[PDB]
């Protein structure tokens, strides 16, 4: 499994979920404490 | 996609070519292209 | 899981599946193999298949023994597509001869320790003398890489820089064997066959065989292993 | 830096991308887009060209001396181009090896003869011309092309290889390598 | 037209000054519709202006002939053109469709009645009346399920749809027997989207195209009675945002889902993409490049099973990880490629070896040729070949531009999606503004974060 | 036999080998055999 | 002041001058680029080879400073920003001049190795003629090539060191001694005793130079800083608010 | 604070910071280049290019940059240099497999 | 430092940078090239800040 290079695909792709709802959650947390959530859509740039 | 191709497309009334900075990049992405991978290229042109 | 039925599935219900790397069993007929028309034949899709990678290893405390390993790349073991020339006589005695196909596998397997060792499982030129029951000969045993492959500092046997240009001093110096030249000399391995379960109808013949060969000797570097390889056989006659 | 007006709305001058060129008692096309190298190959080199953007896509003229009439007495094709095999390069690596299948023991490259043939001029000489494949074990470029032309002048065997990479072969170099190739005209 | 202070929207904000306008909303998107017919109409009339019949059409760079094509009209068998007069007919109707739509959306965008709801009750709506915009989506799910019915019909009746996998190089065909097994037309929708499985990418017979078609065709039609005859349940009011702005959002996420699938499809599919029409694939242009090479020393008489590469490997035939028997080359990242030219090479473990030493095709092996001479790969000055490759070939893939521009839109329709998402959920909240400077949830709450 | 634990400063691998930790995830065992299958419980299993 | 007289002794100990000798502070790079002790040597066997007594014998003659002076080695240019240390520590401690390496090919023209710019850390060792173009190279294909030495044939002489007159015809060692004279002389060096890593480092010269540039660019953002501080000595803490 | 963890506590401090930032940035790449000035570069790590020279399968992506650099400056020296009109054949040119 | 520094350190005014875009471009790949701009240490420094 480390030497087909598996342990990458496991880093990578919960690397991408883990972003992805990092940003999610700035939008949820600007939404929850009364901000605007263009946090999330500033953050869309390093997530692309 | 590729970025810009500007390879040899300033050449002269003689058909000359006219080397420019781009064909300068041109030539140093084939020093970098020659073995980068070196040792997975089977074919000449690389399609993968 | 035989041949018959093997050509009845198509590509789809075999892709992914592990099929492609098994070969086909002879269920019909008797094990008695003597059964098995004699004379002069010319096989067709004979096929090989490993069931146990094993590396040797100099023990430590005097002993010598094949020890289990882990293979390190997935399911491309097989070799198919073999040709030659048989001849089977009254008493028995036969002879193998090898001449083409996918005559080569490479594969790294790991030793229990974080060991690998790279090897090119072939059978390629194989001459078994014998008879149906057993036989043995020796085969051709190329190295792994080609005269042009190029390590970490390009150098090599082809193609390369014949030195580490990168340290404008440790160009002459006990490294002979590293830069200046590179060993492609090939050995020559071991081969043990059994046959069994023949069917005469359709000239089909089956068996286990084993595999003795040397391993990758890294290019003039640090000695290479003894490798032993058990598995299946099939062929085909005619 | 002398006074004229530039080049406006009067057509394109060239387009064709051949220019010709003639040396001592010999001429034909050359590229337009190649250069002409210093880096003489063999000693008895007068003209050379290559392409700027890769070195591989290279012609030279070979003006050695003769010690025959001409080329017919040569004789055949195979027996003419067996006798010049220094052109494609002698192989520099000597160990023995069999990890790279599919060419002869010891050898890294193969010369295939990919078509010989029988040219007749404006009277009665024969122009030579072949084209040989030049592999490798690697197979570099997927391979090299030799496309070779020979004649007899009053003396100076006149040989001629338009040496270029398999990928340009189909890549945009075949029309050209075929348009210097024939004409090699040699008076 | 309005100011910035009677609607509280500037000019950057001019559309949005009409969100609270039904029938100048209805007269935008009418007029948005016509421009979209009207560049249909313009690209397909452009591209069959400068379209050269000698020369395959994904060379010059056409993209709505190889759909027109796919659609099954003006081509025989092997995918040659032969007839542009149905790609004229299409393109002449969208431009008149196109001229209609126009006037029609600048008649209710300039002198249009402002709402609807006081004059025509039927298409009168708010954001809020949920059984009414629930049967005009119904409306739309059944128009949309028609239009399937309509592709259904012409690959059934209307002289069939385009194979690239019919036997000797793909031709029209008509289509019998449609794929109506729950399990197998379903399957794609429950499959992982990594390699070898693609989710729906790897769609790949036309049997299976319109049997899914008739799928989502009845189950459109059904979705659409459903929300004619019913009401949205309580439990979706309360997990759901009700603003116009929500449905914006909504659809403009389905949308970039949408647009990330299709160049997903623009890259690797070749079945309702064919290479004919469309240019190869990347896996198409690989495979295409080792099998030209394996047949090339072959011809010049080497031996693939033999003659192993550098690597040790195998030059020209190597062994994928699962098992199977596949070509040499990098190219085995790219071995789970399937098109209409490698099928009858290939056999029970992979490659039959006696297939492919024995059994060529002359059409096989010029396609996979001139595939190689124009693999999608050239500069956005649409020079040929890699960025080291001089401009010689004026040659980029439709898939490629494709591939690229849908990407593009998918991305930034996502960013649209989020942006008026955000903007539902806290113009929904009633937060559009800001913090009220007197009632800051931040100063009532304990410290320490 | 001539460079045991002892004899390499090993502190408390006797004490892992005392009470049963004999086998180690390396591939070895320090008896001389070959472990098989360690399992869970080997000198790394312990220290993780 | 300073890093005016900064930016001075970083200049002048760069190119050199009257101040800065050779023999106390190490070569300068643009010698090397220069050719300045090889053109000295070559003139000092132009002279007494011109008038009988060729190059034979009188390579003695020249003295064993000169062709230390004419090694890359030698260049303050050659390390690199963390190849720390002395220069022995890099390539040993040179023990003995072998003498100027002439290659000769199988017809009788004196071939000449291309000296090693200062810009690379590797270069290809190749063979030119008198006019210029290169006869030989170190083939890294060694596939279908015509350049190689194992079919030119180039021998190499030395003469006037450790060895003289002595010719070797192995392709192995004129390899190897090609890609020693790519450096410029023809050195030995002792390696063993400070672990010699094999990388040229750089010189005190050199690492003065970069040093000072820094504490100079450093020092200007100081006078930079100081210039406001004196001009704006009255709204630090804050501003008029009016 | 409750994304990231920190959070800035003055409006003054965070201004200056973004002032800190790109002005230490461009100045430590100003003191690189002055290095780079004298041919003192970063090139070669020593004990990494040893253990590569005495393992032949020691792979790693530091010699896969050092290798495609030398490959780069064997490119450059003919077309970029005129004036050391470096006439280097295409044999002696390092290279790959196939290309 | 770099259109000044890097010239009078080096050969002269050649190695310097030429004013234009792919003449930057080509700069910036002969450092890449020789010096191995990536690795430097201050460069990292630079490039995070
Ligand atoms: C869970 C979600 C995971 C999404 C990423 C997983 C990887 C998807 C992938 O492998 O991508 C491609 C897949 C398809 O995979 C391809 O599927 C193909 C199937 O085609 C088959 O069938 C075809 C029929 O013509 C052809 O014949 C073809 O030759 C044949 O192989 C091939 O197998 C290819 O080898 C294989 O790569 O797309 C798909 O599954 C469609 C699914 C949508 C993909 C969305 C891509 C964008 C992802 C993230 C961007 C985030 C944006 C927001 C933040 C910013
Ligand atoms: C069909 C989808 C859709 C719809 C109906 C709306 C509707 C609306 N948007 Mg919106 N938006 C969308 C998608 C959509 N948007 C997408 C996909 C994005 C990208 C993330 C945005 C980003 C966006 C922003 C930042 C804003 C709006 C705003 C608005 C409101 C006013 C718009 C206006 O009049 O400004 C005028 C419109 C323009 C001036 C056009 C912009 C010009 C662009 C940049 C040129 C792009 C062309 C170029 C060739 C694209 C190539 C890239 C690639 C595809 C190759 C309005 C109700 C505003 C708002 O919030 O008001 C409440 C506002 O602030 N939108
Ligand atoms: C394709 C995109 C699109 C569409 C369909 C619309 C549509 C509309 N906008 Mg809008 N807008 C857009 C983009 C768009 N906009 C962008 C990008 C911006 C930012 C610059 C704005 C900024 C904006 C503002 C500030 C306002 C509108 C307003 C309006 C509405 C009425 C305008 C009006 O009646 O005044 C008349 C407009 C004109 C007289 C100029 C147009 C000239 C003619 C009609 C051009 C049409 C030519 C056409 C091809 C002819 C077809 C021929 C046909 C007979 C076949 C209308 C429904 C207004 C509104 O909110 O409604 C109350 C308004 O206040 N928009
Ligand atoms: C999204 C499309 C759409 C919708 C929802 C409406 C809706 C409306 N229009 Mg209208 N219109 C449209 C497009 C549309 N229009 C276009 C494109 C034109 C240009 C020809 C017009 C020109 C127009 C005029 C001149 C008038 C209206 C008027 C009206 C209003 C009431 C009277 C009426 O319905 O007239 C009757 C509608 C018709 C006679 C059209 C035929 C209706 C059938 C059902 C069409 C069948 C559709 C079929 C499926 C084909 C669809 C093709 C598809 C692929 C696009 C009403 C709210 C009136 C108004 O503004 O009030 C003062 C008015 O007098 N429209
Ligand atoms: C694109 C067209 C469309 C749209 C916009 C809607 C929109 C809506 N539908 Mg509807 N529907 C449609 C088509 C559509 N439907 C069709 C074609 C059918 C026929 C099958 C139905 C049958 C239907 C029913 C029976 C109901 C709705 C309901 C609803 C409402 C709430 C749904 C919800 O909570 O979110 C989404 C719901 C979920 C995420 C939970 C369901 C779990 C999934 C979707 C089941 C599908 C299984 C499948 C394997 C999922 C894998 C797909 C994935 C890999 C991408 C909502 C406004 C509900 C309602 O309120 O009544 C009006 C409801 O009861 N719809
Ligand atoms: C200015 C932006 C722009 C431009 C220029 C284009 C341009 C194009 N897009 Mg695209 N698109 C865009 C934006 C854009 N798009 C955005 C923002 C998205 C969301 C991300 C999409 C999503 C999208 C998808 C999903 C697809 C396209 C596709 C296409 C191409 C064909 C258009 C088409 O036929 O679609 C579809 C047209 C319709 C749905 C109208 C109805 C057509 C009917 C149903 C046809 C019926 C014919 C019938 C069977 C004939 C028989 C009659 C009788 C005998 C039965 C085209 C070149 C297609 C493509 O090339 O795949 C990548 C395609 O599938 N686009
Ligand atoms: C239940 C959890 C657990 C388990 C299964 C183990 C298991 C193990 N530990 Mg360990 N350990 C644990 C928890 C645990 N530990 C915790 C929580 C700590 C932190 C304090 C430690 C710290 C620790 C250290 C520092 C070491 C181990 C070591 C070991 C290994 C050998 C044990 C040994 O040295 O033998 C012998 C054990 C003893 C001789 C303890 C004697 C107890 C005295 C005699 C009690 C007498 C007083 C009592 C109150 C009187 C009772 C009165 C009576 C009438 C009832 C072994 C695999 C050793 C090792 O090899 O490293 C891996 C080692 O050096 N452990
Ligand atoms: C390449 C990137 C880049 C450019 C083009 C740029 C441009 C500019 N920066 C300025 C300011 C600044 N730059 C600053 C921080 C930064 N600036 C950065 C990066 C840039 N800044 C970075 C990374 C930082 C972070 C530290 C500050 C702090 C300031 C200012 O105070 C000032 C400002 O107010 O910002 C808006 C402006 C004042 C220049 C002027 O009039 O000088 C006058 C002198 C002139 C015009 C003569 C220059 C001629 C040059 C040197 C020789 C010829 C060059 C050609 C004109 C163009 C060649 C281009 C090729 C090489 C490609 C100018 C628009
Ligand atoms: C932490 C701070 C120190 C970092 C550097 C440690 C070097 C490690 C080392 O080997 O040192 C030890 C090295 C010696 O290193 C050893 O030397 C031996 C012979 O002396 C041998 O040659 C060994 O091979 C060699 O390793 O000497 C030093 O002390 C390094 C001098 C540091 C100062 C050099 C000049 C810097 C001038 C300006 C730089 C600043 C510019 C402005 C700011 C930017
Ligand atoms: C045509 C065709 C076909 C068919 C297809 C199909 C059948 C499809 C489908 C599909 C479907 C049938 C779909 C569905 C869907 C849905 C969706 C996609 C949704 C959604 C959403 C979400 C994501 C959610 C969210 C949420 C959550 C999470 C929870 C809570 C609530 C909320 C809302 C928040 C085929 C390919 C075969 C063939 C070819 C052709
Ligand atoms: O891994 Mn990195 O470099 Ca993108 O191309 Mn294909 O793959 Mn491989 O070769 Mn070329
Ligand atoms: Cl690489
Ligand atoms: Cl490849």
């Known amino acids: 499994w480390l030497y087909n290079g598996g342990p990458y695909q496991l880093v990578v792709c919960h690397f991408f979920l883990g972003v992805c709802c990092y940003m999610g959650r700035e939008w949820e947390l600007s939404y929850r404490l009364g901000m605007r959530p263009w946090i999330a859509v500033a953050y869309s740039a390093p997530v692309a | 996609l590729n970025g810009f191709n500007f390879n040899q497309s300033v050449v002269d009334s003689n058909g000359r070519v006219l080397n420019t900075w781009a064909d300068i990049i041109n030539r140093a992405n084939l020093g970098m292209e020659v073995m980068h991978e070196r040792n997975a290229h089977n074919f000449p042109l690389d399609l993968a | 899981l035989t041949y018959d039925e093997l050509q009845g599935l198509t590509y789809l219900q075999v892709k992914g599946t592990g099929i492609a790397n098994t070969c086909p069993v002879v269920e019909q007929g008797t094990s008695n193999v003597r059964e098995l028309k004699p004379g002069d034949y010319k096989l067709e899709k004979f096929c090989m298949e490993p069931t146990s990678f094993t590396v040797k290893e100099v023990v430590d405390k005097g002993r010598e023994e094949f020890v289990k390993t882990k293979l390190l790349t997935r399911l491309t073991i097989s070799q198919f597509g073999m040709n030659g020339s048989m001849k089977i006589n009254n008493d028995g005695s036969v002879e193998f001869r090898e001449d083409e196909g996918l005559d080569y596998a490479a594969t790294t397997v790991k030793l229990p320790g974080g060991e690998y060792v790279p090897f090119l499982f072939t059978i390629k030129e194989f001459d078994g003398k014998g008879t149906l029951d057993s036989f043995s000969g020796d085969f051709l045993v190329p190295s792994y890489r080609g005269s042009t492959f190029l390590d970490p500092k390009g150098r090599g046997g082809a193609t390369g820089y014949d030195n580490a240009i990168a340290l404008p001093a440790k160009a002459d110096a006990d490294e002979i064997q590293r830069l200046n030249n590179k060993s492609y000399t090939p050995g020559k391995g071991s081969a043990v066959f059994s046959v069994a379960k023949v069917d005469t109808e359709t000239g089909e013949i089956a068996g286990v065989f084993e595999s003795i060969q040397p391993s990758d000797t890294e290019m003039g570097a640090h000695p290479a292993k003894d490798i032993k390889i058990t598995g299946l056989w099939y062929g085909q006659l005619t | 830096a002398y006074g004229e007006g530039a080049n406006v709305f009067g057509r394109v001058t060239n387009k064709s991308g051949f220019v010709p060129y003639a040396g001592d008692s010999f001429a034909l096309l050359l590229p337009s887009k190649w250069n002409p190298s210093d880096e003489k190959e063999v000693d008895s080199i007068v003209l050379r060209y290559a392409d700027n953007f890769d070195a591989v896509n290279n012609v030279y003229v070979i003006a050695q001396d003769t010690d025959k009439s001409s080329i017919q007495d040569y004789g055949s094709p195979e027996e003419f181009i067996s006798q010049f095999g220094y052109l494609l390069g002698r192989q520099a690596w000597a160990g023995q090896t069999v990890s790279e299948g599919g060419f002869d023991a010891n050898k890294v490259s193969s010369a295939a003869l990919l078509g010989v043939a029988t040219e007749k001029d404006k009277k009665g000489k024969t122009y030579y011309k072949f084209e040989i494949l030049s592999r490798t074990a690697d197979g570099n470029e997927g391979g090299r092309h030799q496309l070779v032309k020979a004649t007899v002048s009053n003396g100076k065997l006149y040989l001629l290889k338009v040496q270029a990479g398999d990928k340009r072969w189909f890549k945009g170099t075949d029309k050209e390598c075929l348009g210097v190739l024939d004409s090699f005209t040699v008076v | ?449 | 036999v001539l460079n045991p634990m002892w004899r390499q400063g090993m502190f408390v691998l006797p004490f892992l080998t005392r009470l049963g930790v004999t086998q180690s995830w390396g591939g070895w065992t320090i008896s001389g055999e070959t472990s098989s299958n360690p399992g869970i419980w080997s000198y790394e299993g312990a220290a993780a | 002041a300073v890093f005016w007289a900064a930016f001075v002794v970083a200049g002048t100990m760069w190119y050199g001058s009257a101040a800065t000798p050779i023999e106390l502070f190490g070569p300068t790079r643009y010698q090397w680029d220069q050719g300045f002790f090889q053109q000295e040597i070559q003139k000092r066997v132009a002279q007494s080879t011109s008038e009988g007594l060729s190059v034979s014998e009188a390579w003695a003659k020249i003295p064993e400073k000169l062709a230390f002076y004419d090694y890359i080695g030698n260049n303050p240019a050659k390390g690199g920003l963390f190849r720390t240390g002395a220069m022995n520590s890099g390539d040993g401690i040179a023990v003995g001049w072998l003498g100027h390496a002439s290659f000769k090919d199988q017809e009788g023209r004196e071939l000449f190795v291309r000296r090693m710019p200062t810009f690379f850390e590797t270069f290809p060792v190749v063979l030119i003629d008198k006019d210029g173009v290169v006869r030989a190279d170190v083939p890294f294909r060694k596939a279908e090539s015509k350049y190689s030495i194992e079919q030119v044939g180039v021998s190499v002489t030395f003469y006037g060191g450790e060895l003289n007159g002595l010719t070797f015809t192995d392709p192995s060692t004129v390899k190897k001694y090609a890609r020693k004279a790519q450096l410029g002389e023809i050195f030995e060096f002792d390696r063993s005793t400070l672990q010699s890593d094999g990388v040229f480092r750089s010189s005190p010269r050199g690492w003065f130079t970069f040093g000072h540039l820094s504490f100079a660019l450093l020092f200007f953002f100081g006078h930079i800083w100081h210039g406001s501080r004196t001009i704006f000595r009255d709204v630090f803490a804050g501003i008029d608010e009016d | 604070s409750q994304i990231f963890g920190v959070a800035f506590s003055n409006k003054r401090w965070l201004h200056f910071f973004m002032l800190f930032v790109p002005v230490t940035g461009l100045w430590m790449s100003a003191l690189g280049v002055v290095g780079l000035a004298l041919n003192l570069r970063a090139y070669d790590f020593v004990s990494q290019e040893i253990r590569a020279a005495e393992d032949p399968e020691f792979e790693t992506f530091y010699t896969k940059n050092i290798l495609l650099n030398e490959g780069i400056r064997a490119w450059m020296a003919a077309q970029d240099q005129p004036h050391e009109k470096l006439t280097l054949p295409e044999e002696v040119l390092p290279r790959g497999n196939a290309l | 430092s770099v259109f000044l520094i890097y010239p009078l350190g080096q050969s002269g005014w050649f190695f310097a940078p030429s004013f234009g875009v792919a003449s930057i471009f080509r700069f910036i790949l002969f450092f890449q090239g020789f010096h191995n701009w990536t690795l430097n240490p201050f460069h990292m420094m630079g490039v995070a800040g």
């Open chain 5, 1 to 449: 037209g309005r100011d910035q202070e009677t609607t509280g929207f500037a000019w950057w904000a001019g559309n949005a000054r009409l969100i609270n306008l039904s029938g100048k909303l209805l007269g935008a998107h009418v007029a948005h519709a016509g421009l979209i017919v009207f560049w249909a109409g313009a690209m397909n009339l452009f591209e069959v202006s400068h379209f050269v019949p000698e020369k395959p059409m994904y060379e010059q760079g056409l993209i709505l002939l190889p759909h027109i094509a796919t659609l099954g009209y003006g081509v025989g068998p092997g995918g040659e053109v032969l007839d542009t007069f149905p790609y004229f007919v299409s393109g002449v109707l969208h431009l008149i469709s196109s001229a209609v739509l126009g006037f029609g959306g600048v008649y209710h965008s300039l002198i249009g009645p402002e709402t609807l709801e006081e004059s025509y009750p039927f298409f009168g709506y708010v954001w809020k009346d949920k059984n009414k915009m629930t049967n005009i989506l119904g409306y739309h799910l059944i128009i949309l399920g028609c239009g399937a019915w309509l592709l259904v019909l012409k690959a059934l009746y209307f002289g069939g749809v385009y194979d690239t996998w019919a036997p000797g190089g793909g031709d029209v065909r008509i289509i019998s027997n449609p794929t109506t097994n729950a399990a197998i037309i379903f399957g794609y929708i429950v499959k992982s989207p990594f390699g070898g499985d693609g989710w729906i990418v790897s769609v790949d017979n036309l049997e299976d195209i319109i049997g899914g078609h008739i799928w989502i065709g009845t189950l459109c039609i059904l979705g659409g009675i459903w929300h004619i005859y019913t009401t949205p349940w309580p439990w979706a009011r309360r997990a759901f945002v009700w603003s116009g702005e929500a449905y914006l959002s909504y659809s403009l996420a389905a949308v970039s889902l949408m647009g990330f699938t299709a160049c997903c499809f623009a890259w690797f599919n070749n079945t309702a993409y064919p290479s004919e029409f469309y240019g190869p694939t990347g896996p198409e242009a690989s495979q295409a490049q080792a099998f030209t090479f394996l047949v090339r020393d072959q011809r010049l008489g080497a031996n693939v099973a033999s003659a192993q590469g550098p690597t040790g490997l195998g030059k020209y035939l190597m062994r994928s990880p699962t098992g199977e028997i596949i070509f040499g080359g990098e190219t085995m990242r790219f071995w789970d490629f399937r098109g209409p030219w490698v099928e009858p090479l290939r056999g029970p473990s992979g490659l039959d070896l006696v297939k492919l030493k024995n059994d060529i095709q002359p059409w096989q092996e010029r396609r996979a040729a001139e595939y190689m001479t124009h693999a999608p790969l050239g500069s956005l000055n649409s020079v040929g070949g890699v960025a080291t490759e001089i401009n010689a070939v004026n040659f980029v893939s439709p898939r490629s531009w494709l591939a690229t521009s849908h990407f593009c839109l998918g991305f930034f329709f996502f960013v649209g999606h989020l942006w008026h998402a955000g903007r539902a959920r806290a113009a929904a909240a009633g937060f559009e503004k800001g913090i009220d400077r007197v009632d800051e949830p931040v100063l009532s709450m304990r410290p320490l974060d």
